[PDB]
Amino acid sequence: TCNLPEHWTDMNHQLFCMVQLEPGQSEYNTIKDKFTRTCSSYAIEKIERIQNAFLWQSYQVKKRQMDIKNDHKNNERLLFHGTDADSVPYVNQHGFNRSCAGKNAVSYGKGTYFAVDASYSAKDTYSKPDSNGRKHMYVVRVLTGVFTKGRAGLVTPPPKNPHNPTDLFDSVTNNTRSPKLFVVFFDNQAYPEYLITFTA
Amino acid sequence: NLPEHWTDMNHQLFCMVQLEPGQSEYNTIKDKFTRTCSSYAIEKIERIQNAFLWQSYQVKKRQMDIKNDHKNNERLLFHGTDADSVPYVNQHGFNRSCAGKNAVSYGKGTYFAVDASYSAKDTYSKPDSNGRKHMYVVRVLTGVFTKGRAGLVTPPPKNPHNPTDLFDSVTNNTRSPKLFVVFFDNQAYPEYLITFTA
Ligand SMILES: NC(=O)c1ccc(I)c([N+](=O)[O-])c1
């Protein structure tokens, strides 16, 4: 699938690959710094770039649509998502699925949740340590677009005007002034870009 | 890249286009509907021109055609809905998070019927206060399918030792499918809206 970004490595005609990043090169350093800004006490085992051509293609289609609809290109944020080891193969291949969100982690709506700070996704309740103590967190491109405060029980973002109920916000947050989380409610509004495997 | 049979929308992104009973386009839909719904009468048939939904759906179709190594992945199916959901569906498609539970559930997704008679039941195409019932004709990427189960949140894996390689959809019966369930956004494009009455 097309418009692959220039920093991906050649995939030998594969449509999906996980590429372990070389420590000390610019790309690895950039992601490490984002994580260590709030997670300096954790130890990074490796960082992998997710090269999922089909997921990227569908995400970029949604990004172009949101850029057109909102009349600007300020629609993407880089956020974090902690998950358990058993969900990692699914996310790598299929992205994030609101139908899989826990349960008790839905306080601002029934969508997929993304943290501004890696430290929040680093909680064991999200990046559940596996049998060997390894924890997993994604660095995610998220199409947050135009957002509003969320609330429990939402299944889609609220409309921007209750008298035009189909023109929706793009995401919801806990606090519009100083957001710490964003929730998106549609597939392919979030692209898992890097996987960080780390320990306490 | 919008289809050439669509009306020129003057850079608008969404339009409903009323079809004329003369046309082959109208007649094929009427015939597909009447094959199992001879007791009902069509008020109108509208072509749904939704640029963004079409783009995302066509991307998914190309991906599924590549993955399955054939082009037998799409079926034209029916979906009855209440009038209050029509504005949302026209704009945003079918949302599994909004779907009612089916009387026989083969999974938690959006349901599409082979026969218009199924979608024509008042349980799905609920009559509005003016007696109007609403049924979509939908391009659905059914792909490779298996018999569903009520607990499904996505289609099951084809192979339990490769849990991420999924069937594309599920059905009530693989020998004689009458319903298909899909579990992802942009796997179904609402192409026509039939408004009909008893
Ligand atoms: N999976 C996560 O990183 C995650 C789950 C729930 C929440 I409420 C948050 N959060 O950043 O607020 C993150």
How far lies A92's CA from each of A86, B61, B100, B136, B155, in Å?
11, 20, 30, 34, 17
Q: Determine whether the interchain pair B97/A166 forms a contact, defined as Cβ–Cβ distance below 8 Å.
A: no
Q: Within 10 Å of residue B183's Cβ, how many Cβ atoms?
A: 23
Compute φ and ψ for A51, nearest 5 degrees: -110, 85
Compute φ and ψ for A44, nearest 5 degrees: -80, 125
Interface test with B, best of A15, A65, A67, A106 (most B CBs within 10 A): A65
Separation of alpha carbons A16 and A53, rounded Å: 6
The strand pair at A171-173 and A147-149 is best described as: parallel
Q: Outline where DSSP puts E strands in chain A.
A: 16-20, 43-52, 76-83, 112-115, 135-143, 147-149, 171-173, 181-184, 190-199
Residue B13 CA to chain centroid, in angstroms?
20
Q: Within 10 Å of residue B99's Cβ, how many Cβ atoms?
A: 15
Separation of alpha carbons B101 and B121, rounded Å: 15
3-state helix, strand, coil in chain B (%, to 5): 25, 30, 45
End-to-end CA distance of chain A: 37
Residue window 124-183, chain B: list those with CB within 8 Å of chain A. 153-154, 163-164, 166, 183
- For residue A102 the two structure tokens come to 């826990």
b (16+ CB within 10 A) / e for B107-131? bbbbbbbbbbbbbbeeebbbeeeee
Structure determined by: X-ray
Q: Count Cβ–Cβ pairs < 8 Å, chain A vs chain B.
A: 61
Q: Within 10 Å of residue B93's Cβ, how many Cβ atoms?
A: 23
Which resolution in angstroms does this entry have? 1.4
Q: For chain B, how many residues are written?
A: 198
- Ordered strands of the B110-113 beta sheet: B14-18, B41-50, B188-197, B133-141, B74-81, B110-113, B179-182, B169-171, B145-147
Residue A57 CA to chain centroid, in angstroms?
16
Dihedral sign from CA coordinates of B162, B167, B168, B170: negative
B14 touches chain A (CB under 8 A): no
- For residue B127 the two structure tokens come to 């009559």
Q: For chain A, how many residues are written?
A: 200
Separation of alpha carbons B119 and B193, rounded Å: 12
How far lies A135's CA from each of A8, A47, A131, A199, B163, in Å?
25, 12, 10, 6, 21
Separation of alpha carbons A149 and B130, rounded Å: 37
Q: Within 10 Å of residue A1's Cβ, how many Cβ atoms?
A: 17
Distance from residue A117's CA to the centre of ligand 1 (Å): 10
Contacts of B102-105 spanning 24+ positions with Cβ under 8 A: B102/B179, B104/B172, B105/B148, B105/B150
The type of residue at A193 is: E
- For residue B2 the two structure tokens come to 């919008």
Separation of alpha carbons A19 and A86, rounded Å: 19
